[PDB]
Amino acid sequence: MAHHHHHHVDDDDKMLEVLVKTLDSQTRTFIVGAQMNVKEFKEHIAASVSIPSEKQRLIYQGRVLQDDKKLQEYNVGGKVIHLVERAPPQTHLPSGASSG
Amino acid sequence: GSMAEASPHPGRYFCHCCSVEIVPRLPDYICPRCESGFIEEL
Ligand SMILES: [Zn+2]
């Protein structure tokens, strides 16, 4: 922020230390807010995990966490999520022109 | 789904590490096949 000076604290319970594993070898952090993105968050981590948000599937507690909601819905502050790679959804997404 | 209308029954998980369907060990959400928690409930 730099020179905000309007209640230096605000997050407190917010601001997650998003831990996220990829398969086994890795485990990387994606520190964000509690309720900040998840959507745009996934878009951001896409390259770091080599998994684009469109295929990318965040699983924690067997729950399918995605860009559809917020991070605090999954409450992943300080827990490693599990990333996975699925089979191509070409039958699910017809017409592979737009972002295909 | 067809079985259990709008009721998520945990007999259907999928661990992508095994690339085979599992019935996890919930307390941890581990896979029974490899005990890696890369399981999503289907
Ligand atoms: Zn497994």
Curated annotation (Swiss-Prot), chain A:
Tissue and organ distribution: Expressed by immature dendritic cells (at protein level).
Q: Which domain of life is it from?
A: Eukaryota
- Phosphoserine found at: S95
Q: Where in the cell is it found?
A: Cytoplasm, Cytosol; Nucleus; Secreted, Extracellular exosome
Disulfide bonds listed in the record: none
Q: How is it modified after translation?
A: Ricin can induce a cleavage by the caspase CASP3. The released C-terminal peptide induces apoptosis.
What do we know about how this protein assembles, alone or with others? Component of the BAG6/BAT3 complex, also named BAT3 complex, at least composed of BAG6, UBL4A and GET4/TRC35. Interacts with GET4; the interaction is direct and localizes BAG6 in the cytosol. Interacts with UBL4A; the interaction is direct and required for UBL4A protein stability. Interacts with AIFM1. Interacts with HSPA2. Interacts with CTCFL. Interacts with p300/EP300. Interacts (via ubiquitin-like domain) with RNF126; required for BAG6-dependent ubiquitination of proteins mislocalized to the cytosol.
> Domain comment, in the record's words?
The ubiquitin-like domain mediates interaction with the E3 ubiquitin-protein ligase RNF126 which is responsible for the BAG6-dependent ubiquitination of client proteins. SGTA also binds this domain and competes with RNF126 to antagonize client protein ubiquitination and degradation. The ubiquitin-like domain also mediates the interaction with USP13.
Question: What name has this protein been given in UniProt?
Answer: Large proline-rich protein BAG6
Annotated organism of origin: Homo sapiens
Question: What is the phylogenetic placement of the source species in the record?
Answer: Eukaryota, Metazoa, Chordata, Craniata, Vertebrata
First-to-last residue of the parent protein present: 17 to 101 of 1132
Swiss-Prot record, chain B:
Query: What protein is this chain from?
Result: E3 ubiquitin-protein ligase RNF126
Q: Where in the cell is it found?
A: Cytoplasm; Nucleus
Q: Which residues carry this modification: Phosphoserine?
A: S7
Q: Which domain of life is it from?
A: Eukaryota
Q: How does it assemble?
A: Interacts with CCDC50, EGFR, FLT3 and SCAMP3. Interacts with BAG6 (via ubiquitin-like domain); required for BAG6-dependent ubiquitination of proteins mislocalized to the cytosol. Interacts with CDKN1A. Interacts with AICDA.
Entry remark concerning the domains of this protein: The C4-type zinc finger is required for interaction with BAG6.
Q: Please give the residue positions where the record annotates the modification N-acetylalanine.
A: A4
Instruction: State the organism named in the record.
Output: Homo sapiens
Substitution effect: F38A: Impaired interaction with BAG6
Record's comment on post-translational modification: Ubiquitinated. May undergo autoubiquitination.
